[PDB]
Design a protein around this ligand. Structure first.
Ligand SMILES: *[C@@H]1O[C@H](CO)[C@@H](O[C@@H]2O[C@H](CO)[C@@H](O)[C@H](O)[C@H]2NC(C)=O)[C@H](O)[C@H]1NC(C)=O
Ligand SMILES: *[C@@H]1O[C@H](CO)[C@@H](O[C@@H]2O[C@H](CO)[C@@H](O)[C@H](O)[C@H]2NC(C)=O)[C@H](O)[C@H]1NC(C)=O
Ligand SMILES: *[C@@H]1O[C@H](CO)[C@@H](O[C@@H]2O[C@H](CO)[C@@H](O)[C@H](O)[C@H]2NC(C)=O)[C@H](O)[C@H]1NC(C)=O
Ligand SMILES: *[C@@H]1O[C@H](CO)[C@@H](O)[C@H](O)[C@H]1NC(C)=O
Ligand SMILES: *[C@@H]1O[C@H](CO)[C@@H](O)[C@H](O)[C@H]1NC(C)=O
Ligand SMILES: *[C@@H]1O[C@H](CO)[C@@H](O)[C@H](O)[C@H]1NC(C)=O
Ligand SMILES: *[C@@H]1O[C@H](CO)[C@@H](O)[C@H](O)[C@H]1NC(C)=O
Ligand SMILES: *[C@@H]1O[C@H](CO)[C@@H](O)[C@H](O)[C@H]1NC(C)=O
Lengths: 726, 49
């Protein structure tokens, strides 16, 4: 493995105090795509001053990003104290096709210390640290973000002039305030400026060693380092992953001023990254020597396309996110940053979908009613009901008895009620509670030996319960009974062979034993024919006194279909929203496997009744006959056309929603046609929609002017004047 | 190898104990199931969860 060098000797670590409320700040940084902020330069090609469309991973233009701020640890007097840090260690994030970051944007400005912000210290650039990997989980103290197997680590070392990358297994430390310890709070790393970064001797291992104090390195398979030099200027960086492995990008190597990213490095690791987090860090500087740090930001990559304005020197200077708004779409359609003035079509609102409506046959019912009347059988005489293809609610069935034993084998007793199966089978018999010790598939008792058994090839259950005083149709045996012997005498009249009961089967001895046992210890015998090999059937039984309420036992078995599981606990909207109809909007539907999305409305009745689905010549469903006996009509759904007015001379715009009318128009849209409507809001935050003979519009203003040609006619007598010239 | 081995199934059970989700391997990626499977299969038809 990699020669990382020795593990730090102490198991001890500095305690980490979480001070996270001090780090709440509102300093958003939306992407200025017109400045090409965050643009990754295309791979392997360059261009002239020509504009081209391009496809690749990029940030959304409107994303304000994620913000993080590093700060000094606690210190007092002239010395260091326990760390005060942000709770960023808990920020587990789902990896999502890479990310990019902004570093140092707050350079040459001032802010506050944050942890002790009253100082109002000036701020300087700091490089971020990160951890990436395929899995996360709890620390032994239940803390968030522990990682598994091998993970990526990116840590600057000492001063920002040195950077290192690693692929290793972290190992927890049992020292105080460390990951295997129960005194652990949160992981953090630190830098100590008092000796770190000496002017003639920068401590190249400083950050790594403070990292080592909480984790022992194990099996490092990769390590890399990089040469960086100080520069307070803003820099871009980011990460992507391919089947060729992880790639690293920065603007520093090539384009210090334009900020275009380039692939600075690549990594051999191709193991998929599933999670991402930022590693917390802190400064150990003296309390009067504390220095505020520049703000830091993160943005997420997406499979978008853009206009790119290459400069003749090949740097990208401008870009347009095609999907950001309608106007941006217009620019992309002409591959240009200057569309001629006019009225232009834009994509329609896709509308909005509502909650589903479904109709299917119901009323399955699993014919379980025989259990409620007559006298139940003695346990050797148990009665069975087989059920397939049908709907049930066993928890409702069991509310008809008080249950004094609810157990099962190879299935939890709760799960068998909710699980669908190819079949459901129920056995029932009278059974005194006094015999309950003897009722298990594993029991040593005579009940399992001779009266009832269940196969171990299927999940099974056993239930003991007693009858409520309101089940008057249920009646009871004179005494409870069971067979406590069942064997056959061998034909030599001395040898004897016991007959334990077969799983899911009546004992052979049931053929000689009476439907109830008249007295405890009664026994019977039957001569056997020569076809049986001779011998005598022999059996005996025992009884339990009758009780005020009948006591009963049950057996349940199930078979799970591979794809034949037709018996299920279907309920007719019990505990549900009752979605059999809506009237109405545009919520998807299913009708006996017919499906689509649309609006239903109550209408008349066209023939032929009971053919259910009315269709036009184009096979659009026209309407439907519901099982409530009412015809409903279906119009599927409708969408809102949109167009825009573009005044190239003033570089301003306004919009038209057409025939939809302003009664369906609102300041924001729930439908939606594009990622934002905010470009309209730039002036229309202050105005209501206006209705016109063609349709509802935004930011039109009612001037009531008469003009020959507005160079932007809306048709009809409508016209669309430009703002007056400068 | 002591024996040549392969995974002949990889799926995840749904938490409701009635259905199961298959997991075919993604191109250029390890199957997710590798996290539980042993470096060799100790016996033919062995399964793990
Ligand atoms: C780069 O694009 C520029 C866009 O300005 C082109 O320069 C224009 O060329 C036309 C005719 O050749 C002139 O009428 C314009 O005045 C020029 N623009 C400016 C600002 O002077 C140029 O042709 C393109 N190519 C190169 C190699 O520069
Ligand atoms: C604050 O950050 C850096 C450090 O001063 C400035 O970046 C300099 O920009 C000039 C502009 O031409 C370059 O020539 C220098 O090479 C840059 N780096 C230095 C001086 O280290 C940045 O411009 C400053 N921000 C401002 C002035 O707003
Ligand atoms: C670029 O990196 C190389 C090594 O990758 C640097 O070489 C060593 O850097 C360390 C820094 O702690 C010094 O202590 C050594 O004395 C250097 N050795 C040699 C032979 O140079 C190098 O300094 C880095 N920078 C440049 C500008 O090359
Ligand atoms: C600490 O992280 C949590 C994430 O659960 C976040 O809610 C909180 O705002 C963070 N503190 C900051 C950013 O100062
Ligand atoms: C990876 O992490 C999992 C987490 O439980 C562990 O079970 C497994 O043994 C690890 N694999 C290694 C270290 O190769
Ligand atoms: C990982 O570290 C352990 C240390 O106990 C070592 O025995 C093993 O060979 C290492 N490598 C692996 C599992 O590939
Ligand atoms: C649904 O349609 C029927 C037949 O047209 C009629 O009773 C009424 O319009 C609706 N029924 C209601 C609302 O109960
Ligand atoms: C616009 O102005 C005309 C002037 O005749 C007026 O009749 C009309 O009601 C106005 N409409 C709106 C929406 O302001």
């Amino acid at each position: 493995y990699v020669d990382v060098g020795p593990d730090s000797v102490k198991s001890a670590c500095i305690e980490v105090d979480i001070q996270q409320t001090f780090f709440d700040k509102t300093w958003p940084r939306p992407i200025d795509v017109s400045k090409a902020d965050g643009i990754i330069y295309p791979q392997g090609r360059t261009y002239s001053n020509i504009t081209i469309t391009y496809q690749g991973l990029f940030p959304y233009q409107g994303d304000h990003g994620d913000m993080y701020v590093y700060s000094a640890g606690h210190a007092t007097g002239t010395t260091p104290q326990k760390l005060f840090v942000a709770n960023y260690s808990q920020d587990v994030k789902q990896f999502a096709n890479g990310f990019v970051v902004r570093i140092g944007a707050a350079a040459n400005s001032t802010g506050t210390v944050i942890i002790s912000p009253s100082t109002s210290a000036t701020i300087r650039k700091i490089y971020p640290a990160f951890m990436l990997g395929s899995s996360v989980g709890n620390f032994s103290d239940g803390k968030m973000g522990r990682f598994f197997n091998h993970t990526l680590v990116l840590l600057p070392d000492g001063c920002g002039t040195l950077l290192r990358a690693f692929y290793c297994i972290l190992e927890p430390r049992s020292g105080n305030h460390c990951p295997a310890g129960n005194s652990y709070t949160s992981f953090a790393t630190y830098h100590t400026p008092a000796t770190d970064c000496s002017d003639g001797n920068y401590n190249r291992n400083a950050s790594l060693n403070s990292f080592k104090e909480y984790f022992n390195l194990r099996n490092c398979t990769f390590m890399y380092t990089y040469n960086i030099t100080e520069d307070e200027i803003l820099e871009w960086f980011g990460i992507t992953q391919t089947a060729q492995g992880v790639h690293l990008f920065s603007s520093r190597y090539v384009d210090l001023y334009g900020g275009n990213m380039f692939q600075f490095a690549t990594l051999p690791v191709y193991d998929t990254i599933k999670y991402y987090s930022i590693i917390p860090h802190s400064i150990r500087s003296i309390q009067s020597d504390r220095k505020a740090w520049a703000a830091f930001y993160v943005y997420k990559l997406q499979p978008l396309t853009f206009l790119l304005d290459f400069s003749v020197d090949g740097y990208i200077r401008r870009a347009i996110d095609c999907g950001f708004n309608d106007l941006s779409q217009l620019h992309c359609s002409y591959e240009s940053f200057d569309v001629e003035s006019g009225v232009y079509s834009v994509s329609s609102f896709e509308a909005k979908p509502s909650g589903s409506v479904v109709e299917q046959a119901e009323g399955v019912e699993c014919d379980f009613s025989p259990l409620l009347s007559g006298t139940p059988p003695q346990v050797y005489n148990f009665k069975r009901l087989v059920f397939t293809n049908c709907n049930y609610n066993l928890t409702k069935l069991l509310s008809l008895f008080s249950v004094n034993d609810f157990t099962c084998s190879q299935i939890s007793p709760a799960a068998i009620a909710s699980n669908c199966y190819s079949s459901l089978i129920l056995d029932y018999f009278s059974y005194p509670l006094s015999m309950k010790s003897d009722l298990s598939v594993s029991s040593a008792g005579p009940i399992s030996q001779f009266n009832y058994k269940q196969s171990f090839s299927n999940p099974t259950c056993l239930i003991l319960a007693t009858v409520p005083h309101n089940l008057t149709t249920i009646t009871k045996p004179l005494k409870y009974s069971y067979i406590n012997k069942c064997s056959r005498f061998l034909s030599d009249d001395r040898t004897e062979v016991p007959q334990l009961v077969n799983a899911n089967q009546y004992s052979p001895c049931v053929s000689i034993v009476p439907s109830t046992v008249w007295e405890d210890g009664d026994y019977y015998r039957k001569q056997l024919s020569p076809l049986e090999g001779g011998g005598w059937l022999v059996a005996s039984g025992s009884t339990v006194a009758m009780t005020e309420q009948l006591q009963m036992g049950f057996g349940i078995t199930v078979q799970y279909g591979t794809d034949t599981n037709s018996v299920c606990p279907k309920l007719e909207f019990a505990n549900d929203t009752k979605i059999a109809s809506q009237l109405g909007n545009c919520v998807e539907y299913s009708l006996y496997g017919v499906s689509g999305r649309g609006v239903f409305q109550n209408c008349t009745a066209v023939g032929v009744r009971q053919q259910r689905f009315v269709y036009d010549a184009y096979q659009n469903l026209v309407g439907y006959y519901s099982d409530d006996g009412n015809y409903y009509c279906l119009r599927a759904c409708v969408s809102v056309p949109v167009s825009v007015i573009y005044d190239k001379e003033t570089k301003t715009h306004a919009t038209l929603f057409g025939s939809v009318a302003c009664e369906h128009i609102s300041s924001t849209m729930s439908q939606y046609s594009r990622s934002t409507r905010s470009m309209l809001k730039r002036r229309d935050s202050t105005y209501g929609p206006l209705q016109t003979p063609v349709g509802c519009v935004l930011g039109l203003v009612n001037s009531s002017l008469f003009v020959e040609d507005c160079k932007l006619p809306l048709g009809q007598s409508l016209c669309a004047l430009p703002d007056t010239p400068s």
